[PDB]
Amino acid sequence: GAHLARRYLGDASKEPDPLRMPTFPPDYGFPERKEREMVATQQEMNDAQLMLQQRDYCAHYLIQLLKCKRDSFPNFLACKHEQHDWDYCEHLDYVKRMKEFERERRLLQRKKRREQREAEMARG
Amino acid sequence: SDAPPLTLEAIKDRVLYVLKLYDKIDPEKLSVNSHFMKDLGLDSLDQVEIIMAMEDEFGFEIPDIDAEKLMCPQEIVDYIADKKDVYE
Amino acid sequence: HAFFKAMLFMCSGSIIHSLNDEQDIRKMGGLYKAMPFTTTALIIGSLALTGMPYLTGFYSKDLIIEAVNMSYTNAWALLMTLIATSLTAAYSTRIIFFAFLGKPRFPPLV
Amino acid sequence: QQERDPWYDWDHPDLRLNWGEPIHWDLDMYIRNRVDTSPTPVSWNTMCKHLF
Amino acid sequence: SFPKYKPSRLATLPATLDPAEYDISPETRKAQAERLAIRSRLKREYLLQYNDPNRLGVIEDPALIRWTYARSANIYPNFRPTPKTSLLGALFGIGPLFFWYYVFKTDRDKKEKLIQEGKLDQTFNISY
Amino acid sequence: VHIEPRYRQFPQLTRSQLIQAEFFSATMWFWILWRFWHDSDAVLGHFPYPDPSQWTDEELGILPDDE
Amino acid sequence: SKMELPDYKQWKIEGTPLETVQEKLAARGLRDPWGRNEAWRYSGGFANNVSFVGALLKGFKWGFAAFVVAVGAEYYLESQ
Amino acid sequence: SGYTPDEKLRLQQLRELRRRWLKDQELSPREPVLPPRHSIFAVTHVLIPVWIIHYYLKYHVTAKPYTVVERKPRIFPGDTILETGEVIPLMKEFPDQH
Amino acid sequence: PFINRFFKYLLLFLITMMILVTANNLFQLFIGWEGVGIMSFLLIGWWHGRTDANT
Amino acid sequence: GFMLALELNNTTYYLKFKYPSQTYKFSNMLGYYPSIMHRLPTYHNLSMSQKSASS
Amino acid sequence: MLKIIIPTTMLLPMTWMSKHNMIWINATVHSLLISLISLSLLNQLGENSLNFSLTFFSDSLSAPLLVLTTWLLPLMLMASQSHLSKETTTRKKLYITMLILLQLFLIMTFTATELILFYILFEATLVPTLIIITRWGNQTERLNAGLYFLFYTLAGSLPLLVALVYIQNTTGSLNFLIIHYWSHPLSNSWSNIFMWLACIMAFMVKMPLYGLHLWLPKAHVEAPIAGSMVLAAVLLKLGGYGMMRITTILNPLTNYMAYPFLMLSMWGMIMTSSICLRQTDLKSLIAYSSVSHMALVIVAIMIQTPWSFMGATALMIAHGLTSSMLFCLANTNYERVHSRTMILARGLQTLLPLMATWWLVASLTNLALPPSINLIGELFIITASFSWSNITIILMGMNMMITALYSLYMLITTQRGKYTHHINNIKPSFTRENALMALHILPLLLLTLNPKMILGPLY
Amino acid sequence: AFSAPAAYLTHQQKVLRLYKRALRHLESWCVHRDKYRYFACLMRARFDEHKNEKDMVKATQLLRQAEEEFWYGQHPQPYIFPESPGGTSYERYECYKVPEWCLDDWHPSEKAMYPDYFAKREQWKRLRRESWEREVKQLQEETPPGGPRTEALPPARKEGDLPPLWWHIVTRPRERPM
């Protein structure tokens, strides 16, 4: 995407590093951040044997989808609402990750502006 | 099954069929015994083209050393019959 | 891929057997009407191979391309994968066009 | 052995050898199940450059 | 006019591109005649035994006998100790031995002194 | 079904092979149309892709450059 | 059984690309003496063939008709 | 150009001989003189093999520990365990973002 | 003329590939590996009078 | 892939003849990989097998 | 142990008092019965060996070798009676006597408790083999072959004898049990280095180690079929067995005295496999394949691990069976066409289909196809070598490739293609030849079901 | 394959073989029939342009650049007939070709089947046995003292003779033996 063009062809110092982020404190620009909550307990995911990569903040919808698939086994066309709910929750998680990326790049650009412009007003 | 076993009459008919579609040959005075050079007045390039047409007709190619000396339709029929194990 | 690749090979085998064990596409002419069931099967197999939606190859290939597009991956590898995806349709087109379209190019004893 | 005439009536058609003719020192290397030295449409040293 | 084809060891010069087949002298024609005569005499000698109804067994080929003998038993009597043969023998016979000795000895010295230091991660290594 | 060669003529066809070929081509096309009518998102995606530029600074937590 | 070859007087290059080849050769002073040997590939049941997109859409009409019937059944069934 | 008379005559003689030889490869009407239940397939190729294998697994293989190991079944909230009668409670009252 | 041997060879390849797929240790999987390799060798050179097939 | 291949295949009907490109030669002869790797390493290995190891 | 030795000795007057047309039948039947009796030695203990008496003992290493020897005698008799038909009655009985004496010496060699008795029988095996090669070999080279077979062995074994008596002067005994229980380390000295060399080089020559192997192609090519069978199947293993017994007194010297032999074995294994690719003689190819397999066995014994010892035992047994079968297969075609050139008789699958199947199975076991015991031994040795140093795989894997490349090569050269036109005396396979091939191949396959029976003491 | 080769190829033969190879490779390049016919007529015209050249040095050099042009412009993957030396069915049926002498080694039980075939086989063997010496005598008579010069063989010339060295040509296995 255009982010790769900005990081590789433009100034990389103004662009987020996907491997190393976030670098700014999570409570830096926010006055009050509510910690992300989880519905499914560790035991419930362990008993469902989901996968270590499926045990994210969307695991409860996946658990209901799996239970619905098992219960109506012959009718493999019955777990549509559960599949939709799990997909929607994953989509919201991805949107949150995009928001984190955009927040961190905006913070880093604002940091560069403030630091070098207070230097600019500090050099004369 | 596969193709029917080949016969001498079929080989001769197909050779004459191909020769009669050649523009440099009169269809009515063409015989199985007609020499390409003496009777039909062709040259070596026409003989090469006739050999190639026969190869296309029967789906197999004749080596140059053998092809050089097929100078009449009967010779071509005999060569094909001997190559493909046709006795009747 | 097992399904449609095996089907494509058997379609090729039927063509070869019909044309007296000929395997060169340059001597295969218009088989679209002469071998209708074989033509249908090879068309459907080539559509499955190229990822036509809601066919067997779609549910597999479609997802693989999306996953490569949406991963922290080598950029050259991703570009090469996309180019290979185009070349797949290219050689499927080559097979169909040369083996089934146009005029016959096989020996006259049909 | 792949370079020999395949339309000649060899005494050993698969080996493309004639009875009594002198045998190359490296026949078992050139039996045409093996190393081939036949001319190619594109020159050697030009295939090498393109491949490398 | 067109790019020229140059031959190599593993991609030889085609006959049609060979100038020797286009510059023909009477001695060349007579040499070709002699070659054909030799081939024909050998062919008749072979075919008189091949078609013999009373012949049963193997038609012994002196060329095959000569080839196998030259490849096996004629080699040592024709060997002469030469700087070229001496260096080739020394290299191809002894150099790989010291090369592999050095490689394996270096690897095992590293592994052994690394075992001594107690840093090799030998856990679950009970079969050897 | 005994079929003979024809020598420079179009081969003899049976009705069964024609009807089966047509039936299976039509089956493939109907399946594609039916699935696209019911499962279009699988081609077109179901969720909208957000535009990061339409996100305000307050909801992403960026101060107005003076702190 | 025992087929006989069709009469050779029918194979003509007229109306086929072989005629175009013949006229473009005559524009150069040349002639093609093998066109009638090739005419059968264009004459009869091989006179017309489909295009690539037409070959891809081999059974689209019947399948589309069946799909329309099925969606109409869906429309007229769900109102009970 | 063409055959020499000797070549053509030799080819004709060889052709005659070869055609008679090929004619003699044919068989007379008596040449091979030879000297002097519906579901039976599914009972001998399926039912019998599965009898032996089931007997072998049930009474010999499973007579030793850890020879046949299955991964435990998945347990979901709300399930009832057959073995003990235990009931797993449901899953924490979703926010219900409908 | 050897269609029965051909079907036997196909069945042998299928058995070796099933062994490969269902193997739980590396030795059994290697057995299936080499079995499918050998069956491939035998079926590629089916027409063993042809030099190209053996090559 | 479909459109470009179809266009290039339809241009084969034109009464025009041109000698092939070098890219075409690379593609058709399989990157020259079997022309080099099936001749050079095999020749050198067999040559050393006779000249050095045996003799 | 006398229940094996005395019937073998009784084989001699039985063949010398038999009717002129009954020698082969009697010898074959009674050698088979002796093999059946010897099959009872396979019941081994674990902790320690079966110590029958002060003179003879049986181990899990000795018993498979003894069974292989007793089984190889009837196969040699079956393979010998075809080309010895024109021979007189007395010379046929003398040939059978040579075979019986060889078996007797080998049986006593594999079970001797004391190292001097083992050495004496180990040398005694030389005389019948020499007589067989130089009296019933076909070509003029056999005489030279005999000389090469003799002085290579003695030039190695004469120092060993000296070392042996020297040891008994300082240790006080040469009984193997006493030697093993009272074993002491060898210090790092020149005297110890030369005593190590004297203890090892005879078995090295017998293996043969690469560089000391020139006698083997000559002797195996020029020998008659029974001579080649016993030379490859059993006699070579006399080296391996010997090493496995004598390395118990060579620690910790072997820790560094083994480097040149390991380098020679690995590189020469590559070298002999490569030599097999360019060989015009069919028997020479089999001989060089034996050299390569024995090089792998040398590596296994030199690295001194339980996995390597197990692999070496399995590979010794498997190679004995496979090499004997390959020699018999080549001899069938030799008796057909009276030439050992590999390219003379081609396309034999068309003319001899069942013999082609035998060829295929022998070639498969030669390249160690799983789950054959050939690959069991090879894989155990390769795993032990990898533990010794991870770079060894590079050579080992290379060897594997070359092995397959020549094995199938042989198979493709003699069985496939088109038949030679002028060779018209290729008769159908006899029941004797097919039975000989089967009696080679079936025990080899059955050993897969019970591999431990050949895995040795370290199992 | 059936004709004995000569010591060398004439200029006329070389020119004809070049014509055939060029036309075949052109057909490989020009897949379609009408286009191939057009360009083959152009090739034939370009080839006839020098049909009546008298200076053989000029004709030889023309042949040289024709060969050079062919080698530069040849098809890398020309069409090969399936049973031609480079074809996909070249030696496919060789494994089914069994020499006739093998029939002599059949068990008498095997020959009990097919009695008439083996009666005719005995007749053929008698013919070969009775003709061999006359064939050898004819070959000795007709061969110049300096040995044969080519591989051509003479026909039979008397009333009841057979062409010398005929058995293995006449008793070929088959092209489709099974």
Ligand SMILES: CCCCCCCCCCCCCCCCC[C@@H](O)O[C@H](CO[C@H](O)CCCCCCCCCCCCCCC)COP(=O)(O)OCC[N+](C)(C)C
């Ligand atoms: C064709 C194949 C035939 C079979 C080949 C058999 C291979 C046998 C080779 C024996 C391997 C090693 C032998 C002895 C071990 C070390 C040898 C020496 O080179 O090492 C140095 C020895 O120092 C010097 O180098 C002295 C040796 C040099 C004099 C010997 C002549 C070597 C030239 C090569 C001759 C070729 C031999 C084979 C002939 C066929 C180590 O120095 P140092 O740790 O302080 O002394 C150790 C000995 N101590 C402990 C008793 C004191």
Ligand SMILES: CCCCCCCC/C=C\CCCCCCCC(=O)O[C@H](COC(=O)CCCCCCC/C=C/CCCCCCCC)COP(=O)(O)OCCN
């Ligand atoms: C197929 C060819 C094989 C050739 C094999 C030749 C090598 C055999 C090994 C050496 C043979 C003789 C060794 C003697 C037996 C060792 C017993 C012993 O321990 O005696 C040593 C004595 O060792 C010696 O004297 C041996 C020295 C060498 C004498 C003969 C030299 C011959 C050439 C030497 C190098 C060749 C040996 C290795 C060749 C490898 C194979 C090619 C110590 O005894 P003491 O005198 O009491 O001393 C105690 C205080 N230190």
Ligand SMILES: CCCCCCCCCCCC(=O)SCCNC(=O)CCNC(=O)[C@H](O)C(C)(C)COP(=O)(O)O
């Ligand atoms: C498509 C891929 C490659 C294509 C490239 C090929 C390039 C070739 C271009 C044109 C070739 C020439 O100019 S070819 C130049 C050759 N010159 C001569 O032949 C002059 C003397 N003429 C004769 O010898 C006879 O007339 C003869 C012609 C043999 C007929 O003889 P018949 O009447 O007795 O058959």
